[PDB]
Ligand binder design. Structure first.
Ligand SMILES: OC[C@H]1O[C@H](O[C@H]2O[C@H](CO)[C@@H](O)[C@H](O)[C@H]2O)[C@H](O)[C@@H](O)[C@@H]1O
Length: 435
């Protein structure tokens, strides 16, 4: 029997990347096979399980989909092989061509590639288009619109990622960079949360926003335990009319509405969409069915730019995504690197975004009319990539992030001025190596 290349991804996209792997297996003509294996649903726990396999020298571990913040650590640990170790010498060129350069930077350490981007990510504003006329453009307007809805007994929750984990650090980073701040200096060696008056003011403003959302009159009473999934559910279940979340929320809403899970969008009652869910449960409609389902959603659901912190200042939205790394444990370097190239080829990218919701990194797709029609999020994604925020690249990232979320949470108890100083001190201890 053939070589088996393991391909670890978060369970959130197991269905999509199982499909991509199966396409690759057919394209590979039997020379080897790729098998998808699922990691946990939240970032911190995805890393822990990879770290366990790597530290335990799991020789069956071949390809791993890393979050865009683990590159420096995995490179320095020897866990992610440099692309230059590809026996075929093709990995570096494949990663570099027709690949968005912002995402590509997240796969680098010390000027060298240790992974090939496969998906990027940038959060959008999602809103109930039937309950307001235009969406909020700033966090002040988010709070005012939520208060209006709360006064009328409407869905008053703002759906955010507020629990003690990476998603809270992402929220903070976006608000911070949108206000003109940054966590670390460009070289990663100094803390810049409070080192100048303008940097301090950006940190305080970001903390003011998180605190205000957490203490808002109609706020989610479980906001201190919220993540991507609770935010998606809060809007689908009619408890929130305002949500910030990644682009996968659109196909999720259409799919669950067709299945009968969205009260205010009973697409299950529409006979023309029978069969839009395929044999394994994935929303995969005809072109006509997609248009009809998307158009119906527009009555009650829209997306817009992530809200900024001040008027006429577009948000700087934190980049997310996945970069494919070959694990140093692999017994089959040549096939692992070849698997990476197949998994991220242009037609697999097309499917990854249209079916999975995850933004492609292949630059060409954002100009492709067929892609634009079936992945309507593309234009706001592109707009937000032009001024994206990026979490710092540092080999102490996980340690720094754990301290930050432990300082930010519970978000109900943030004090903007004092938490700003505690955050700066906790980050300093992280880059100092205290751990
Ligand atoms: O597409 C949704 C993804 O949500 C998570 O990943 C995003 O959010 C993380 C923080 O919670 C970021 O660190 C990451 O960069 C983002 O891509 C989830 O972990 C992914 O599995 C989902 O695809």
């Amino acid at each position: 029997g053939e070589i088996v290349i393991s391909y670890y991804t978060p369970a959130n996209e197991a269905a999509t990347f199982t499909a991509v792997a199966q396409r690759c297996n057919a394209e590979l003509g039997g020379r080897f096979r790729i098998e998808q294996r699922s990691l946990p649903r939240e970032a911190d726990a995805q890393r822990l399980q990879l770290a366990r396999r790597l530290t335990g020298n799991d020789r069956s571990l071949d390809v791993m989909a890393l979050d865009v913040v683990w590159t420096a650590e995995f490179a320095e640990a020897g866990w992610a092989l440099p692309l230059s170790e590809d026996p075929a010498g093709l990995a570096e060129a494949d990663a570099t061509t027709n690949t968005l350069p912002g995402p590509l930077e997240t796969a680098k350490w010390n000027g060298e590639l240790y992974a090939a981007p496969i998906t990027t990510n940038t959060q959008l504003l999602w809103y109930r288009a039937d309950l307001m006329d235009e969406p909020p453009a700033t966090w002040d307007e988010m709070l005012s619109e939520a208060a209006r809805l709360h006064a009328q007994g409407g869905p008053s929750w703002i759906a955010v990622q507020g629990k003690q984990y990476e998603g809270l650090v992402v929220w903070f980073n976006t608000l911070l960079e949108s206000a003109g701040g940054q966590v670390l200096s460009d070289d990663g060696q100094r803390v810049t949360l409070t080192d100048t008056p303008e940097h301090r003011a950006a940190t305080v403003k970001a903390l003011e926003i998180i605190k205000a959302v957490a203490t808002a009159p109609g706020a989610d009473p479980s906001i201190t335990q919220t993540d991507e999934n609770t935010a998606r559910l809060a809007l689908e279940q009619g408890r929130a009319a305002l949500e910030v979340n990644w682009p996968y929320v659109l196909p999720s809403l259409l799919e669950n509405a067709i299945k009968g899970g969205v009260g205010f969008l009973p697409l299950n009652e529409n006979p023309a969409l029978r069969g839009s869910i395929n044999d394994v449960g994935t929303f995969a409609p005809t072109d006509e069915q997609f248009d009809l389902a998307l158009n119906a959603s527009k009555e009650v659901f829209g997306f817009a730019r992530y809200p900024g912190v001040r008027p006429d200042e577009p948000a700087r939205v934190t980049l997310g995504g996945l970069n494919l790394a070959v694990a140093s444990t692999t017994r089959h370097k040549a096939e692992a690197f070849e698997a990476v190239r197949c998994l991220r080829n242009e037609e697999n990218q097309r499917l990854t975004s249209i079916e999975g919701g995850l933004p492609a990194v292949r630059t060409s797709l954002y100009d492709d009319p067929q892609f634009q029609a079936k992945y309507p999020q593309y234009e706001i994604i592109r707009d937000q990539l032009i001024n994206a925020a990026v979490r710092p690249a540092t080999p102490v990232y996980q340690a720094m992030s754990t301290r930050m979320s432990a300082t930010l949470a519970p978000i109900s108890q943030i004090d903007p001025e004092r938490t700003a100083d505690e955050l700066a001190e906790q980050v300093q201890q992280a880059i100092d190596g205290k751990g």
